[PDB]
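I am sending you the entry underneath: sequence plus fold tokens. Let me know what the token row says about the fold:
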Amino acid sequence: VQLQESGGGLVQAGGSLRLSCAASGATGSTYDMGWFRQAPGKERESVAAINWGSAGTYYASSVRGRFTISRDNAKKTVYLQMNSLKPEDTAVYTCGAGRIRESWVTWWGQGTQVTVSS
């Protein structure tokens, strides 16, 4: 299982982005996917996760009501829609897959930068 993120960018506070994470390799099998983020000098934290079969969602408190995680089985891609971005949302966002802390993750992507200026 190989993961590649895209959709990062640089926007002002109040703006929106949508991150993508495409899975490749053994994409026949089903795995849950999550988004994580890490600001320079800080420990990485969970943002959101999704069950592949049910599309059941999980959200960190910091992003509730602002970010939406979703998945498309045909495209084997998970998405993070981000609205009402805040400067403190600035970080590298990484995708991970495994079966539902980040210890449940078995395969990690590369990371994509999100910057939100004041």
Notes: The chain has one domain: 1-118.
